From TrEMBL, chain B:
Compositionally biased residues, Low complexity: 185-199
Main subcellular localisation: other
Keyword annotations of the record: Vacuole
Family: Belongs to the 7S seed storage protein family.
Compartments where found: Vacuole, Aleurone grain
Functional description taken from the UniProt entry: Seed storage protein.
Annotated source species: Lens culinaris (Lentil)
Cellular component terms (Gene Ontology): aleurone grain
Keyword Lyase: no
Domain of life: Eukaryota
Record's protein name: Allergen Len c 1.0101
Pfam family, one: Cupin_1
Record has Iron as a keyword: no
Length: 365, 363, 365
C-alpha cells in the first residue's frame, strides 16, 4: 500500500529541547508511482512556548498551514518587513529565498506547522541558508572570505567575527516574553478580507465550508479564491470528520491530494489499478500522510474526531465527484437508460438505492 | 524511420462484436527522440450502429475528434449533465475524471473517434475507472468493502451487490428508444463558430486557413477555442486530393501528431550530422510525428484526410518553402538571395515564381 | 567547482576567418546539480566586419544580446521580413523555427552576440536548418527527393540544383559595402526608454539601471518590463563593475542566473553546500560563464572594469537580497530582538556594523 506514508517516514532534520523540523521522505523514492510529486516535499515544524526558529531562507516556495497554536511569522524582503499573528488554520505562501523567522507566541500551547515545499533549483531538493550559527557550521556569511567580508561590511574581520559569525542554543532557541511582546507589536492577523490577500495569511475556515452537515466540515481555498495559490496551482483544505462518521466515496477529477492527519484516528479506503481494481486500506494516525492520485476514489472513516489538511496539486478546474449521497453524486446524474445498462439492477432498483443515503459529503458510519 | 507509426502499433485494449478501443504504443518507447511526447497518448474508438461505450472516467484530459459517424456523447459533472450530437469533424475537450458515455446513433454508419489523451498522475499512464466492470474485472465500486458501501449507500450489502456490483460488457447494444432518451436536448456544434468554452466545435466551421482546388487545411488553435488554451494544442484537418501534395512546410514551434483518417499517400520529412530524408507510405490508421522545424511534404495517391494534434500550438508559425503564399524563402532580401544561393537574386526570384499555387499544388 | 564554466567548455560549431559559433557544454553534463538547466543552451557568435551569418532556423527559442559591435538582423515570418540595426546592449527574442540572418555592418569592430537557446523538440537538443547552398554545407532543401522538389517549385530538378542547392564561403561569408547599404535600408533601431517592445529589439541600458553608483551599474530587463521575456520567464541584465570595486554579497530569491563575462577580469565567491556551507571561488575572464543557483549568495570582485551579461531563469517575482550596504540589505530588516538572538553581537553592535558600509549594491574593494 504505497499511498500511506506513516508518521515514521518523516526524517528529523533538526531537533533540540525547544522544537523539531521533520521532512517527509521523497514521494517518488517511496514509489515511482509518485514521480509527478518528485518536486513536492512536506515538513512538520513544532516548538514549545516562547521559542523561535531563527532567520532562515530555502530555495523552495513554502505553503505554511498552522496546525495548532499561536505564532508570530516575520517575512523579510530586501527593503520591507512584515509580521503576522498566526492561529490554527492560518495559511501563507512564503516564496523561495524569503528570510522568515517563526516564534511560538503562546505561554502554554505548542506550535505545529505543516509545510508544502516546492523547490526551485533541483527537483525535490531543499538547500536552507542559516543566518544564525551552529556546531555543524556557523552562519552562511562564513562562506565569504575575509577580503570579501571586510570589503562588503567596511569593517575589520575581527569585529565581523565578534558581531556576526563566531544544540539548544541553535536554530530553535528560547525567547523571553519581553522579546515576544516586542516581536508581536503591530503584527497583522488574518481576516475574511484576508482570504483573498496577495501577501498576508488567509484562514481555511475564514470562508464557509464547501460541504457541511452534522457529520463533517470540508473547507477548501482554491486558486479561484486566493492568488498566493494561482502560480503554484495548489488548493489547501481542512476536512473535519466527526467521531463515527465517514467522508463519502469521492474522486478528484485532476487534483493529486497530499492529505496529512493533524489530529484524531481513522481509516481510509482508496480504489486504484487490461487490469482489475484493488483496495488500498490503512489506519490513519496523527502525522500520517495519504497521497490520493486524480480519479482514484477514496472514503475516510473517523474513530475519533479526525482533522485532515490536504494540499491539492493540479487545483485549477478540480471537480470533486461523490459516488453516494444527494449533492455532488455523479452516479445519480447517469440517465435512466444507461443506469439500466451500466448496472445489473433495473433503472428503478438503482434509483431507489441512490435515495437511501439522504446525507451529502459526510454521513454516519 | 522513427517518424511513421503503422496501424500495426495500436495495441487493442478492448474488443467485442460491438466495437474496438486501441492505444498507440507510447511515443517515447518507439524512440528517445520523442522524450517530450512521453505524456501524450492516442486512442482510436470504433463502435457499430446502436452501441454505447458504458460510463467510465480516465485520469487524463481527452481531445476527441469524430473521424466518421454520428454520436451522442454524454458528459457528467458532480451535480449536472450535458450531452452532445457529434457529427464528422466534431471536436471536444473531455476533462480528466469526467464520467462520459458515447453512443453510436446512426442506423448504418460505424462510429470512429480519435482521442489525444494527456495523463494527470504519471507520464503516459491511462488508469481508467469503469462503473459497469467486465465480468472478470468488476465495477470500481467493488474496491470499497461491505462496511464502507453499507455506510455510504445506507443499504444492506446484499442489495448493493444485486443492484450496482454483480449480454457483453463495456461496449453494448442499445435500442431505438434509448438513442431517443440520450438524444433529448443533446447540443450540436455551431455551424459558423469554433469559440465555445464547453460545446463541441467542428474543424470545418471556420474557413480553412489554406484552400485551393488541390487541397484544404482547417486548423483550430488555442487563440480560436478556449478548450485548447490550458493544454496548448491545435487540432487540424488536412484534405489533399488524389495527385496533389501539401507543399514543403515546417511548423515554427509545434510538434504535430498526424493521423491518417482516410486515403493513401507518401510523406517526405527532412531531419538531421548532415540532413537525412525520412520517407514512408501513409495508409489509414497510420500516425506521422512532425517535430518542430522539421520540414515535411505530403503526396496523396488517393484523396487523403489527415487529423493533426499540434503540441505547443500557441505562437506556432507554419512557413511554406515553395509556392506564393507563406513562402518564407521569398522574404529573404535580394542581396542575401545572391549570397545564400549558388544562383543570382534574379534566377532565385524567377525559380520561386514558377510555383504560382499556394500551400497545395499538383504532384 | 561546478558553478564556473571556462571558455574551454565552449565547443566550436562553425569557424572560418569570417567568424565562429560556439555552443557551451550542457549544464547537466558538467554536473547533475544543474538538471533544472538541462533545456538551456548558451552560444557566442563572432564575425569580422562586412560578414553575414547565412539564413537558418533552430528548433529553439533564442534570446539574443549584442555583447559588442554593429549588426543588421533580418527576421522572416512566412509573408513578411523585419530588419534591425543592432548596437551593444540590444537584446531580442527569436522564436524557434524563425529564419534570421545577421550582418556585421561595421567597418572595424567584430560583432559579438550571446544567445540563450531554449529547445522545443528534445531537452537541450539544438537541430539547426541551413538554407545556405554554398561550396560545402548542402541546403536542407536537398533532403527532399527530385519528384517532390520538381513538383513543389514546378521546376526541372537540374535548375533547382543549379539555382538553390549545389571554408570562408560556407556559413559566415563576406558582404560588400553595397550589399550592407541595401540591407541597412528599412533597418529600425531600439528605442531610449525602450525596454517595452513586443517584437523589435530592446536595449539593456534604455531604462535606468535598477542599481547605480560610482562603483557599478546593474541594468535589468524583466518579464514585467518587456513581454518578449514573459512566456519564457527570463530576465536579462548587464552588470558593469568598475575596477577595484565589488558587487556586494547578494542572492536571488528564485532566479537561476547564467552569467557570461563579456569583458574584464575579476573573481567571484559563491556560497553553496557540500549539509554545511562551502565557498566556491574562481577567477573570471572574458567568455567565462558563472551559474548562480537561486538563494545561493554571490560576491563578484572586479580587477579591471568588469561587464557581465546574465540570463535569469524563473524571473517573475525574483527578489534580489543584499547582505551588506544600506539599500536592499535584508539583514537590516531583522527586528531588533532577533538581531540579539540570531547573532553573537547585541542588537546595538550589529546595527552599528551594518551602518559601516555606506554604499548600496556596489562598493570599493
Amino acid at each position: 500500500n504505497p499511498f500511506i506514508f506513516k508518521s515514521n517516514r518523516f526524517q528529523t532534520i533538526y531537533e533540540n529541547e525547544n522544537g523539531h523540523i521533520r521532512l517527509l521522505q521523497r514521494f517518488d523514492k517511496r514509489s515511482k508511482i509518485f514521480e509527478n510529486l518528485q518536486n513536492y516535499r512536506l515538513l512538520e515544524y513544532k516548538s514549545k512556548p516562547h521559542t523561535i526558529f531563527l532567520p532562515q531562507f530555502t530555495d523552495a516556495d513554502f505553503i505554511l498551514v498552522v496546525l495548532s497554536g499561536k505564532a508570530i511569522l516575520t517575512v523579510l524582503n530586501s527593503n520591507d518587513r512584515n509580521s503576522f499573528n498566526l492561529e490554527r488554520g492560518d495559511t501563507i505562501k512564503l516564496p523561495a529565498g524569503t528570510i522568515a523567522y517563526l516564534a511560538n507566541r503562546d505561554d502554554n500551547e505548542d506550535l505545529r506547522v505543516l509545510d508544502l515545499a516546492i523547490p526551485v533549483n533541483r527537483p525535490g531538493q531543499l538547500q536552507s541558508f542559516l543566518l544564525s550559527g551552529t556546531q555543524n557550521q556557523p552562519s552562511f556569511l562564513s562562506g565569504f572570505s575575509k577580503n570579501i567580508l571586510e570589503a562588503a561590511f567596511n569593517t575589520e574581520y575581527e569585529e565581523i567575527e565578534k558581531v556576526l559569525l563566531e544544540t539548544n542554543e541553535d536554530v530553535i532557541v528560547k525567547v523571553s516574553r519581553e522579546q515576544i511582546e516586542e516581536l508581536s507589536k503591530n503584527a497583522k492577523s488574518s481576516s475574511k478580507k484576508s482570504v483573498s490577500s496577495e501577501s498576508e495569511p488567509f484562514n481555511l475556515r475564514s470562508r464557509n465550508p464547501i460541504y457541511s452537515n452534522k457529520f463533517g466540515k470540508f473547507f477548501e481555498i482554491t486558486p479561484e479564491k486566493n492568488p498566493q495559490l494561482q502560480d503554484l496551482d495548489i488548493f489547501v483544505n481542512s476536512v473535519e470528520i466527526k467521531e463515527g462518521s465517514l467522508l463519502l466515496p469521492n474522486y478528484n477529477s485532476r487534483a493529486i491530494v497530499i492529505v496529512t492527519v493533524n489530529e484524531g484516528k481513522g481509516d481510509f479506503e482508496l480504489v486504484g489499478q487490461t487490469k482489475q481494481v484493488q483496495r488500498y486500506r490503512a489506519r490513519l494516525s496523527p502525522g500520517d500522510v495519504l497521497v490520493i492520485p486524480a480519479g482514484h476514489p477514496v472514503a475516510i472513516n473517523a474513530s475519533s474526531d479526525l482533522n485532515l489538511i490536504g494540499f491539492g496539486i493540479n487545483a485549477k478546474n478540480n471537480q470533486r465527484n461523490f459516488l453516494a449521497g444527494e449533492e455532488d453524486n455523479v452516479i445519480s446524474q447517469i440517465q435512466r437508460p444507461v443506469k439500466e445498462l451500466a448496472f445489473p439492477g433495473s433503472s428503478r432498483e438503482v434509483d431507489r438505492l441512490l435515495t437511501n443515503q439522504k446525507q451529502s459529503h459526510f454521513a454516519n458510519a
